[PDB]
Enzyme design. Structure first.
Site, PDB file in Angstrom:
ATOM      1  N   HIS A 131       0.901  -0.944  -0.130  1.00  0.00           N
ATOM      2  CA  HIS A 131       0.177  -0.010   0.427  1.00  0.00           C
ATOM      3  C   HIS A 131       0.580   1.140   0.212  1.00  0.00           C
ATOM      4  O   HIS A 131       0.256   2.344  -0.294  1.00  0.00           O
ATOM      5  CB  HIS A 131      -0.965   0.034   0.871  1.00  0.00           C
ATOM      6  CG  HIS A 131      -0.766   0.584   2.377  1.00  0.00           C
ATOM      7  ND1 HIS A 131      -0.536  -0.561   4.218  1.00  0.00           N
ATOM      8  CD2 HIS A 131       0.063   1.259   3.222  1.00  0.00           C
ATOM      9  CE1 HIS A 131      -0.418  -0.042   4.649  1.00  0.00           C
ATOM     10  NE2 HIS A 131       0.058   1.217   4.733  1.00  0.00           N
ATOM     11  N   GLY A 176       2.849   5.902  10.425  1.00  0.00           N
ATOM     12  CA  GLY A 176       4.504   5.654   9.820  1.00  0.00           C
ATOM     13  C   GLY A 176       4.982   4.715  10.373  1.00  0.00           C
ATOM     14  O   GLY A 176       5.710   4.265   9.559  1.00  0.00           O
ATOM     15  N   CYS A 231       3.831   1.437   9.000  1.00  0.00           N
ATOM     16  CA  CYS A 231       3.483   0.352   8.912  1.00  0.00           C
ATOM     17  C   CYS A 231       4.802   0.262   8.341  1.00  0.00           C
ATOM     18  O   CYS A 231       5.868   0.750   7.970  1.00  0.00           O
ATOM     19  CB  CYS A 231       2.416   1.209   7.800  1.00  0.00           C
ATOM     20  SG  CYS A 231       1.131   2.036   8.248  1.00  0.00           S
TER      21      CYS A 231
HETATM   22  C1  LIG Z   1      -8.512   4.496   7.219  1.00  0.00           C
HETATM   23  C2  LIG Z   1      -7.457   4.661   7.847  1.00  0.00           C
HETATM   24  C3  LIG Z   1      -6.008   4.418   8.322  1.00  0.00           C
HETATM   25  O1  LIG Z   1      -6.326   2.927   7.834  1.00  0.00           O
HETATM   26  N1  LIG Z   1      -5.375   4.370   9.313  1.00  0.00           N
HETATM   27  C4  LIG Z   1      -6.111   5.950  10.264  1.00  0.00           C
HETATM   28  C5  LIG Z   1      -6.190   5.276  11.739  1.00  0.00           C
HETATM   29  C6  LIG Z   1      -7.449   4.338  11.975  1.00  0.00           C
HETATM   30  C7  LIG Z   1      -3.956   4.486   8.963  1.00  0.00           C
HETATM   31  C8  LIG Z   1      -3.782   2.785   8.422  1.00  0.00           C
HETATM   32  O2  LIG Z   1      -4.246   1.787   8.984  1.00  0.00           O
HETATM   33  N2  LIG Z   1      -3.847   3.277   7.090  1.00  0.00           N
HETATM   34  C9  LIG Z   1      -3.086   1.244   6.579  1.00  0.00           C
HETATM   35  C10 LIG Z   1      -3.270   1.461   5.079  1.00  0.00           C
HETATM   36  C11 LIG Z   1      -2.789   2.544   4.727  1.00  0.00           C
HETATM   37  C12 LIG Z   1      -2.738   2.876   3.430  1.00  0.00           C
HETATM   38  C13 LIG Z   1      -3.681   1.661   3.253  1.00  0.00           C
HETATM   39  C14 LIG Z   1      -4.406   1.695   3.483  1.00  0.00           C
HETATM   40  C15 LIG Z   1      -3.895   0.631   4.386  1.00  0.00           C
HETATM   41  O3  LIG Z   1      -5.563   0.348   2.820  1.00  0.00           O
HETATM   42  C16 LIG Z   1      -5.370   0.299   1.323  1.00  0.00           C
HETATM   43  O4  LIG Z   1      -4.493   1.829   0.834  1.00  0.00           O
HETATM   44  C17 LIG Z   1      -3.050   4.428   9.975  1.00  0.00           C
HETATM   45  C18 LIG Z   1      -3.053   5.092  11.837  1.00  0.00           C
HETATM   46  C19 LIG Z   1      -2.301   5.156  12.647  1.00  0.00           C
HETATM   47  C20 LIG Z   1      -1.776   4.126  13.063  1.00  0.00           C
HETATM   48  C21 LIG Z   1      -1.077   3.089  12.057  1.00  0.00           C
HETATM   49  O5  LIG Z   1      -0.896   2.202  11.679  1.00  0.00           O
HETATM   50  C22 LIG Z   1      -2.469   2.947  10.595  1.00  0.00           C
END
Ligand SMILES: C=CC(=O)N(CCC)[C@H](C(=O)NCc1ccc2c(c1)OCO2)c1cccc(O)c1
Lengths: 305, 302
Positions: free
Chosen positions: B41, B143, B145
């Site tokens: 992603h 960040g 991830c």
């Molecule tokens: C919906 C919002 C959300 O998911 N949030 C915000 C907090 C709910 C972040 C997250 O999970 N991103 C992962 C992600 C990134 C790109 C993508 C995806 C999933 O699917 C396809 O494209 C988040 C926020 C805080 C911490 C964290 O580890 C991730």
């Protein structure tokens, strides 16, 4: 989101851990530049540990009586020397992995990471607080002696703790890296006990602030209080006095959430009297006191090393 | 003595943490030999979050669209491919710090250490367990991830988790290092159903055996129980079924304490019914399910 007992990354300290062997006693040493730091009691046999004369026991011993193993390589000792309760062995090689570092003494209530080691091999890492009674609730078995406690600040490892001994309540006692014991303990197999331990009020408050920042809000009330009034409650429940210093330190979390501190004290006051009424805070039934304000902020801001 | 949630020394993993950038998106990657692994992603733009087409986003990229940073050094990407939900970037320098390692898929109830990272810099290390609903209760900000979970057995690092996302309830979903998600999750920001969490029964039993070994017997009683009657009571407290395999696995701890598994099940039963009446076990005022039978053996001998 989320909140866990988080230790510092241990890689900088893993590179400094070595095995120190003297007779049949084996334990851990810290190898920084050309010196290996470890507990002085490595020169004691089981007989001699009952009532040891260290200067006398040490004066007998020569360089070749100390085996130092750094992984599967031998370090030749070329100098021994005592500072307070730590043995300083000078070795023929400087540690190529010596991090930027300093020795510091922590106060009760401050936290640190412990790298547990056995035969100079790191086995695990965990977060600890120096308790008010100067003990740490660690997890050490036999051979864990010489295990160190540390904080990281930018690139700089601050060593604050060396493990010496276990007490009969299952808690642990050790020195700073300059061999000064934390608390009224001595390095001798003997009848030593921990004082009456107390709860670190400023840490509990900081952890309530961590709960609010993570959506747990049920303990907040409309009520404020005074330091004097709250401290009388603290004293009664075996809690450390809260000081104006502590209130200033909780300033950033008081600003970030709009809860006063005396407000949050009112919440803690009520939590202390009426209990948790079957609820939990951050998945705990008891009030956690092993997180500092700085620990809370760092974990809810994500600073790296 | 003492019993603390103990993570593995993070050093061998710290040496593999890198930064991956694609467009405005930056997250962590795992550099082993000449390959960097990260959440695919990373290649999504802010309008690709709901229904990303990864094959179509990836074919529009060349090697030089991926900035890989290992400290202050820039790594040169010379190839890229996708395996399930992880992007694999071929780079021209083998990681000199590459430990002995393997990738392993863990089962719910298994524990591992997480190295939480931001911009390819390690922030902290903590222990956690794969919950029965295939989530983990981590600490992970924006960040984080590409942060990885692992076990170390001798010199060998077993990588078992890469962090991909946070669910609306504040729990964390991720994949193995072959890019297959744990649980029914997808890398889409659609409404995703976090299944009902249960207590990991076999872990609580191990932790009770651990309390006995550290000389605490106050919660035992003179009853035994059948497996089936234990499970009928346990489900009512949202505890996972205890199976014969769980019972075989506790055999060593049974033999060390001289308390049969079904006698210890009788204790838990009574513990579930009474609570603890102001007592604590290994310093806890509730029953701890994030230590496995193997974790207890590693940290306890009495
Ligand atoms: C919906 C919002 C959300 O998911 N949030 C915000 C907090 C709910 C972040 C997250 O999970 N991103 C992962 C992600 C990134 C790109 C993508 C995806 C999933 O699917 C396809 O494209 C988040 C926020 C805080 C911490 C964290 O580890 C991730």
């Amino acid at each position: 989101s989320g909140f866990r007992k988080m230790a510092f990354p241990s890689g900088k300290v893993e590179g400094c851990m070595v095995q120190v062997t003297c007779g049949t006693t084996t334990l851990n040493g810290l190898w920084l530049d050309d010196v290996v730091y470890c507990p002085r009691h490595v020169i004691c046999t089981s007989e001699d540990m009952l009532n040891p004369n260290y200067e006398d026991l040490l004066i007998r011993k020569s360089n070749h009586n100390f085996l130092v193993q750094a992984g599967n390589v031998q370090l030749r000792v070329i100098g021994h020397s005592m500072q307070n309760c730590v043995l300083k062995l000078k070795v023929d090689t400087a540690n190529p992995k010596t991090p930027k570092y300093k020795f510091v003494r922590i106060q009760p209530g401050q936290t640190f990471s412990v790298l547990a080691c056995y035969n100079g091999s790191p086995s695990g890492v965990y977060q600890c607080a120096m308790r008010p009674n100067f003990t740490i609730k660690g997890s050490f078995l036999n051979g864990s002696c010489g295990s160190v406690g540390f904080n990281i600040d930018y690139d700089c490892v601050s060593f604050c703790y060396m493990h010496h001994m276990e007490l009969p309540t299952g808690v642990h006692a050790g020195t700073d890296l300059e061999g000064n014991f934390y608390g009224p303990f001595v390095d001798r197999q003997t009848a030593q006990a921990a004082g009456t331990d107390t709860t670190i009020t400023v840490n509990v408050l900081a952890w309530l602030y961590a709960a609010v920042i993570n959506g747990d809000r049920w303990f907040l009330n409309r009520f404020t209080t005074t330091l004097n009034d709250f401290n009388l409650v603290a004293m009664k429940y075996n809690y450390e006095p809260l000081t104006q210093d502590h209130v200033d330190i909780l300033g950033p979390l008081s600003a970030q959430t709009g809860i006063a501190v005396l407000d949050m004290c009112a919440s803690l006051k009520e939590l202390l009297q009426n209990g948790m009424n079957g609820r939990t805070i951050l998945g705990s039934a008891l009030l956690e006191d092993e997180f500092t304000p700085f620990d809370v902020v760092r974990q809810c801001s994500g600073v790296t090393f």
